[PDB]
Amino acid sequence: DGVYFSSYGHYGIHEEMLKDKIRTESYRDFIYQNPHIFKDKVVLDVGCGTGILSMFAAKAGAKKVLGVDQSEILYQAMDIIRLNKLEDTITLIKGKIEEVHLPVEKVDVIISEWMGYFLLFESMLDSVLYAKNKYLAKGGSVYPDICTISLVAVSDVNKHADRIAFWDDVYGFKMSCMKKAVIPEAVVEVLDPKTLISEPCGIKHIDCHTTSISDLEFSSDFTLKITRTSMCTAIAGYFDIYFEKNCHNRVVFSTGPQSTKTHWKQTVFLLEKPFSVKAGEALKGKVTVHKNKKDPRSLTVTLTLNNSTQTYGLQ
Amino acid sequence: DGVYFSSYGHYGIHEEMLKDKIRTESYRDFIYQNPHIFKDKVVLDVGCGTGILSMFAAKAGAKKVLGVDQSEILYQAMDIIRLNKLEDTITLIKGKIEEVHLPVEKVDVIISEWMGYFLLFESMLDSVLYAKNKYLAKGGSVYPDICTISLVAVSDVNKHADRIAFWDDVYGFKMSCMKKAVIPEAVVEVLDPKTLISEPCGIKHIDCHTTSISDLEFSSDFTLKITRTSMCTAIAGYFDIYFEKNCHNRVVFSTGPQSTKTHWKQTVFLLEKPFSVKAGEALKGKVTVHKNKKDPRSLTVTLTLNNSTQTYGLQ
Ligand SMILES: Nc1ncnc2c1ncn2[C@@H]1O[C@H](CSCCNC(=O)NCc2ccccc2)[C@@H](O)[C@H]1O
Ligand SMILES: Nc1ncnc2c1ncn2[C@@H]1O[C@H](CSCCNC(=O)NCc2ccccc2)[C@@H](O)[C@H]1O
């Protein structure tokens, strides 16, 4: 989509992503501490951006790195690779991974940073799975290989009031009809871990080696173990990223609220009707994640909890 | 423009603007403390958004309020006015102020919140001046009536290094070619007032009663009185808003770094080549503000200082 690749044309998003130390050091450590994965191999960097994953792979001893991006950032990547004198190892190709012509039939390794808010926002894993099905050699590997999504309950009456009740009295005037636009929009924000009132519950496990495209729309029945008697005002979502297959030095990071903040923050679903929970309670709910019918890069999250159902949107 | 009015269709920008207490209380105080300006008058709210200025004017005793917005937010304004039982005083009209049909020939008062980053970003004052020339009755008033733009010198080597030098060494790789995209982009951020190294210099005075459209593209020769021997790394811009004409209770707010933060923050122009200044020095420069030839809602700021010239863009 023209709007989608246009946004990634600007250096601003690439600066934010590169300055995310948890993200950037995790990939750096994965590659530098497992050079047996890259030594003398053919590597495909899907959505290479500025191209630093391709340069990591070269440093780790890749025979050949193919960096692919549809964004205009690829022209910056070309200059960056030339500035670093790596043009004999790294080839950059402008286009969608779905339609570009590659100068090889097969690659030994696919690496990518495809993750959106709540993991699946932007639907870029579909592109990586296209690349894997078409190009990954027999016995090849895709990294990161394992991803999880988790939910956790939140009590934060003040944050709820600031976003919702706010619209009841604005300098004496009623603006209550605005609440209808607010509730269905998922909020991307850093969550104070003091406001967590449950143990986390895993709602999705993905292995990029065995997952199909169709698996990326899913339902889960979840149980949240309530740890604090309180008013439940929201459910928050986050994701964990693992580098595992054939690793001597496994790497993990979490985007959860108990972990150092990343640029992905946490995804918060505000409850239209907050409700009381008790420590020890097993809170049962159902969550379904779909691609938005209108824009398949946008997500729909359907949440059933406390005998009420709300659908939330990520952009 | 479709992109422009689309952005103002979402409640998010209206929430941010309404929660800016300095902005919102300034307009509230102006209207509530000068009701003689509104009593039994016909009022035009140009770009009414959620419509709360129209409701302020009604409370202050307006005979008739016409709220105009091209954005889809106008449908929310219609519901808000009905919820407050003000539909007999306030009429909302969907369209551009340049082309809508008004049910009156003339209005006594125009009120608007048209100000962008560095005052003139988005070029919405052109629309307010259209409305004034077409609709303002003989002896009518436009608010806010007086605006200034100021510049101030900054020393912040660390912030400069974080935005510019950062690209020289990214995990051992050279990304110096990215600096070319960064320098020309004006930064909108809250400036630490401890990093100011000059007295402010006014570069523009606008009275909305007498200013022409053509006056909104301007040049100024400025002098910054340096107060701290230091490395000058940036020039910051901000603006002041006055309610004056026929006021018994005059109202002012500043978006400057010595004042409480607003959603407009400050506009920062990073210098490609920081240079040394001395306390007592009279630093002479020239600044020109133009509409972007490609998109006239975008600004071009041409800065000459220390015998070097850089053009900066606001989106
Ligand atoms: N179908 C597609 N075909 C081709 N390109 C596509 C497609 N879908 C999306 N894209 C691009 O994918 C990127 C995603 S954002 C990651 C940038 N890469 C990056 O920082 N690498 C360095 C790095 C450093 C440390 C840790 C991780 C990564 C954008 O540039 C999109 O334009
Ligand atoms: N040519 C045009 N014709 C018609 N509408 C146009 C045109 N150019 C821009 N617009 C609209 O102008 C608004 C600017 S943003 C201020 C919203 N109003 C607001 O908060 N009022 C309440 C308030 C409270 C306290 C203090 C001040 C204000 C947007 O909604 C645009 O869609």
Side-chain angles (χ1 to χ4, degrees), chain A residues 1-2 4-5 7-58 60-62 64-81 83-84 86-95 97-137 139-158 160-179 181-182 184-193 195-224 226-260 262-272 274-283 285-292 295-314, chain B residues 1-2 4-5 7-58 60-62 64-81 83-84 86-95 97-137 139-158 160-179 181-182 184-193 195-224 226-260 262-272 274-283 285-292 295-314:
Chain A
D1 165 75
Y4 180 70
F5 292 117
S7 67
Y8 279 118
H10 189 257
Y11 70 90
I13 182 56
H14 298 279
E15 193 189 341
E16 179 184 8
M17 287 189 298
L18 285 163
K19 287 177 170 179
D20 183 341
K21 295 225 270 273
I22 295 289
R23 159 194 193 270
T24 299
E25 296 176 350
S26 289
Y27 274 83
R28 188 273 315 274
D29 289 357
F30 160 57
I31 299 167
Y32 284 7
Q33 298 175 8
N34 300 278
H36 67 281
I37 290 172
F38 299 89
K39 182 203 190 166
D40 297 326
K41 300 294 179 181
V42 181
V43 179
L44 177 58
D45 183 6
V46 180
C48 61
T50 56
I52 188 145
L53 283 198
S54 296
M55 301 198 284
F56 286 160
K64 198 177 317 166
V65 188
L66 305 175
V68 173
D69 209 302
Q70 166 58 10
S71 175
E72 292 294 292
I73 202 69
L74 191 71
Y75 300 135
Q76 281 287 355
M78 286 172 86
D79 293 346
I80 286 161
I81 271 50
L83 208 59
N84 288 284
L86 293 169
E87 64 265 43
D88 287 354
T89 301
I90 306 171
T91 296
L92 304 173
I93 309 175
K94 217 304 202 149
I97 193 57
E98 289 90 355
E99 48 195 40
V100 288
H101 173 62
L102 289 202
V104 298
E105 293 264 16
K106 297 300 173 177
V107 304
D108 306 303
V109 180
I110 297 167
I111 58 178
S112 181
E113 199 289 76
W114 54 261
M115 292 83 66
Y117 301 129
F118 198 50
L119 189 70
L120 295 172
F121 182 55
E122 289 180 36
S123 301
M124 185 182 157
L125 180 52
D126 303 53
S127 294
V128 173
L129 289 181
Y130 179 88
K132 161 167 136 281
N133 293 329
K134 180 140 190 195
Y135 294 121
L136 192 62
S141 297
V142 49
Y143 301 96
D145 48 320
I146 303 160
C147 312
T148 64
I149 310 174
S150 304
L151 298 178
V152 61
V154 180
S155 181
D156 196 335
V157 293
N158 295 338
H160 195 280
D162 293 342
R163 268 218 98 211
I164 300 305
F166 168 78
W167 297 104
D168 294 331
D169 185 347
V170 179
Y171 292 87
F173 304 104
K174 293 205 65 167
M175 298 192 154
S176 280
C177 51
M178 293 294 289
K179 286 161 155 186
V182 179
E185 295 217 349
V187 166
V188 174
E189 75 179 19
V190 174
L191 213 57
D192 184 351
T195 71
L196 302 183
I197 62 161
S198 85
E199 291 177 353
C201 190
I203 58 160
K204 188 51 161 185
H205 177 106
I206 290 172
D207 188 313
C208 293
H209 289 109
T210 59
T211 190
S212 74
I213 286 265
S214 72
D215 286 330
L216 303 190
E217 299 193 296
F218 71 94
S219 286
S220 189
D221 295 287
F222 61 86
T223 297
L224 297 171
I226 293 105
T227 54
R228 281 225 312 274
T229 296
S230 62
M231 189 70 25
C232 180
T233 56
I235 304 298
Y238 63 90
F239 62 87
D240 298 350
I241 303 300
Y242 300 81
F243 302 79
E244 218 167 84
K245 174 181 177 194
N246 292 331
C247 293
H248 288 116
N249 291 300
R250 284 180 177 182
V251 167
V252 59
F253 66 93
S254 179
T255 58
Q258 311 263 52
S259 303
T260 304
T262 80
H263 83 282
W264 288 285
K265 312 192 175 164
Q266 289 93 39
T267 303
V268 187
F269 315 102
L270 294 169
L271 300 184
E272 186 169 33
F275 66 97
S276 73
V277 294
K278 290 161 168 70
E281 175 179 346
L283 182 60
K286 197 174 182 184
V287 61
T288 306
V289 175
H290 292 122
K291 285 174 168 79
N292 179 309
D295 179 8
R297 298 193 175 282
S298 282
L299 286 188
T300 288
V301 183
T302 304
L303 190 61
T304 298
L305 193 66
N306 194 40
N307 297 300
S308 202
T309 296
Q310 178 67 230
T311 300
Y312 301 88
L314 278 79
Chain B
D1 165 75
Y4 180 70
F5 292 117
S7 67
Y8 279 118
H10 189 257
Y11 70 90
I13 182 56
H14 298 279
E15 193 189 341
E16 179 184 8
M17 287 189 298
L18 285 163
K19 287 177 170 179
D20 183 341
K21 295 225 270 273
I22 295 289
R23 159 194 193 270
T24 299
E25 296 176 350
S26 289
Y27 274 83
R28 188 273 315 274
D29 289 357
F30 160 57
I31 299 167
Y32 284 7
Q33 298 175 8
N34 300 278
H36 67 281
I37 290 172
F38 299 89
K39 182 203 190 166
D40 297 326
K41 300 294 179 181
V42 181
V43 179
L44 177 58
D45 183 6
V46 180
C48 61
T50 56
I52 188 145
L53 283 198
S54 296
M55 301 198 284
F56 286 160
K64 198 177 317 166
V65 188
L66 305 175
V68 173
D69 209 302
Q70 166 58 10
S71 175
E72 292 294 292
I73 202 69
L74 191 71
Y75 300 135
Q76 281 287 355
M78 286 172 86
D79 293 346
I80 286 161
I81 271 50
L83 208 59
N84 288 284
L86 293 169
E87 64 265 43
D88 287 354
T89 301
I90 306 171
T91 296
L92 304 173
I93 309 175
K94 217 304 202 149
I97 193 57
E98 289 90 355
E99 48 195 40
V100 288
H101 173 62
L102 289 202
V104 298
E105 293 264 16
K106 297 300 173 177
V107 304
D108 306 303
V109 180
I110 297 167
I111 58 178
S112 181
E113 199 289 76
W114 54 261
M115 292 83 66
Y117 301 129
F118 198 50
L119 189 70
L120 295 172
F121 182 55
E122 289 180 36
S123 301
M124 185 182 157
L125 180 52
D126 303 53
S127 294
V128 173
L129 289 181
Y130 179 88
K132 161 167 136 281
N133 293 329
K134 180 140 190 195
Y135 294 121
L136 192 62
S141 297
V142 49
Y143 301 96
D145 48 320
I146 303 160
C147 312
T148 64
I149 310 174
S150 304
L151 298 178
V152 61
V154 180
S155 181
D156 196 335
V157 293
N158 295 338
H160 195 280
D162 293 342
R163 268 218 98 211
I164 300 305
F166 168 78
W167 297 104
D168 294 331
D169 185 347
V170 179
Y171 292 87
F173 304 104
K174 293 205 65 167
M175 298 192 154
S176 280
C177 51
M178 293 294 289
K179 286 161 155 186
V182 179
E185 295 217 349
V187 166
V188 174
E189 75 179 19
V190 174
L191 213 57
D192 184 351
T195 71
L196 302 183
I197 62 161
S198 85
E199 291 177 353
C201 190
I203 58 160
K204 188 51 161 185
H205 177 106
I206 290 172
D207 188 313
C208 293
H209 289 109
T210 59
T211 190
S212 74
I213 286 265
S214 72
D215 286 330
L216 303 190
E217 299 193 296
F218 71 94
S219 286
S220 189
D221 295 287
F222 61 86
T223 297
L224 297 171
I226 293 105
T227 54
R228 281 225 312 274
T229 296
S230 62
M231 189 70 25
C232 180
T233 56
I235 304 298
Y238 63 90
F239 62 87
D240 298 350
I241 303 300
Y242 300 81
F243 302 79
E244 218 167 84
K245 174 181 177 194
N246 292 331
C247 293
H248 288 116
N249 291 300
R250 284 180 177 182
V251 167
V252 59
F253 66 93
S254 179
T255 58
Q258 311 263 52
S259 303
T260 304
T262 80
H263 83 282
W264 288 285
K265 312 192 175 164
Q266 289 93 39
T267 303
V268 187
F269 315 102
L270 294 169
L271 300 184
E272 186 169 33
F275 66 97
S276 73
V277 294
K278 290 161 168 70
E281 175 179 346
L283 182 60
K286 197 174 182 184
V287 61
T288 306
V289 175
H290 292 122
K291 285 174 168 79
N292 179 309
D295 179 8
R297 298 193 175 282
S298 282
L299 286 188
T300 288
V301 183
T302 304
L303 190 61
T304 298
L305 193 66
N306 194 40
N307 297 300
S308 202
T309 296
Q310 178 67 230
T311 300
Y312 301 88
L314 278 79

